[PDB]
Amino acid sequence: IVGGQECKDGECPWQALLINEENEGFCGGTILSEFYILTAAHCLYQAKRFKVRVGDRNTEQEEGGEAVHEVEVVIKHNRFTKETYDFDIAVLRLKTPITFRMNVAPACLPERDWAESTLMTQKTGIVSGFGRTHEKGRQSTRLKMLEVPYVDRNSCKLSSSFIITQNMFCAGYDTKQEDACQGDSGGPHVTRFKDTYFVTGIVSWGEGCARKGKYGIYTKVTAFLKWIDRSMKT
Amino acid sequence: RKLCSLDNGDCDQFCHEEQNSVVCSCARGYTLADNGKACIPTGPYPCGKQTL
Ligand SMILES: N=C(N)c1cccc(CN2CCN(S(=O)(=O)c3cc4ccc(Cl)cc4s3)CC2=O)c1
Ligand SMILES: [Ca+2]
Numbered sequence: 140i141v142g143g144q145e146c147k148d149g150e151c152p153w154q155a156l157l158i159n160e161e162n163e164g165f166c167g168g169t170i171l172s173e174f175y176i177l178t179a180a181h182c183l184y185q186a187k188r189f190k191v192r193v194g195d196r197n198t199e200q201e202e203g204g205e206a207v208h209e210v211e212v213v214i215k216h217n218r219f220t221k222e223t224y225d226f227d228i229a230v231l232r233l234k235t236p237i238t239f240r241m242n243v244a245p246a247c248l249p250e251r252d253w254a255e256s257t258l259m260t261q262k263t264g265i266v267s268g269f270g271r272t273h274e275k276g277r278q279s280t281r282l283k284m285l286e287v288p289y290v291d292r293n294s295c296k297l298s299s300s301f302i303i304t305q306n307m308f309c310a311g312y313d314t315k316q317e318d319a320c321q322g323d324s325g326g327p328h329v330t331r332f333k334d335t336y337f338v339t340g341i342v343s344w345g346e347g348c349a350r351k352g353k354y355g356i357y358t359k360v361t362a363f364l365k366w367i368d369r370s371m372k373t
Numbered sequence: 374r375k376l377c378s379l380d381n382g383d384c385d386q387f388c389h390e391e392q393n394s395v396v397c398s399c400a401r402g403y404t405l406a407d408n409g410k411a412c413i414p415t416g417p418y419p420c421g422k423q424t425l
């Protein structure tokens with residue numbers, strides 16, 4: 140996360156962190172329930188074998204709320220394309236259930252119609268992760284969150300040097316130095332409605348990070364709600 | 374500014390318009406209150422809530 144603030148105690152409880160064989164975080168995820176994690180399908184390519192860590196806010200200490208979970212099933216979208224990052228969604232079923240506590244709680248899955256018309260028409264959403272703090276910078280040892288405004292579909296299509304499919308949407312700033320970045324991918328993009336947070340996106344990609352004239356591109360979760368559902372029942 | 378467009382229809386979460394009317398609903402882990410608008414957590418750590 141470039142810019143933004145630190146997630147304070149109990150502020151980003153749905154944040155999950157995919158860790159590799161060397162226990163280094165390489166992608167993010169969103170807790171959907173005790174057994175399911177939502178992440179990006181392109182992340183399943185960044186590591187040979189991985190696990191999911193929850194309740195972490197500082198990868199430099201052992202706060203005591205952290206818990207590592209093994210993945211029992213990886214459910215990636217059958218139509219994901221590495222070439223365009225289209226259909227960049229994956230659901231992970233954990234071997235053992237996540238026990239909710241402080242800093243470990245699920246984000247709500249909204250209903251499509253209500254979400255697209257009431258949630259995504261809101262001014263901003265929140266993106267979070269342990270990803271890079273710069274384009275060349277190192278990753279964050281601290282979990283960060285960033286309030287990113289929703290960006291007009293047309294404006295974003297114009298801004299991008301790459302196709303923005305129907306399964307993506309954009310958020311971020313035009314010139315301001317604030318945006319998700321590498322390592323945040325797969326992470327949550329949530330929208331608050333009356334003190335309750337709903338998952339609205341999956342950190343997907345962007346051209347660089349916080350680059351002027353470029354926005355962060357997220358998987359349009361509202362377009363995969365029926366898919367997530369049959370996935371969380373298999 | 375009608376139904377779900379006028380303040381989410383007074384619903385806590387999901388708002389739907391059925392037969393020219395507002396019908397509220399909630400995410401899994403919440404139950405619609407008796408007023409048919411508010412959403413009450415069914416247990417500890419309901420989705421979408423920052424932990425305290
Ligand atoms: N070949 C393509 N289709 C392509 C299209 C756009 C960008 C890139 C290369 N690329 C891929 C991803 N990284 S990153 O890991 O640093 C990310 C930056 C960023 C910024 C915002 C959001 Cl929402 C998500 C991400 S991932 C940035 C970057 O420049 C490749
Ligand atoms: Ca820690």
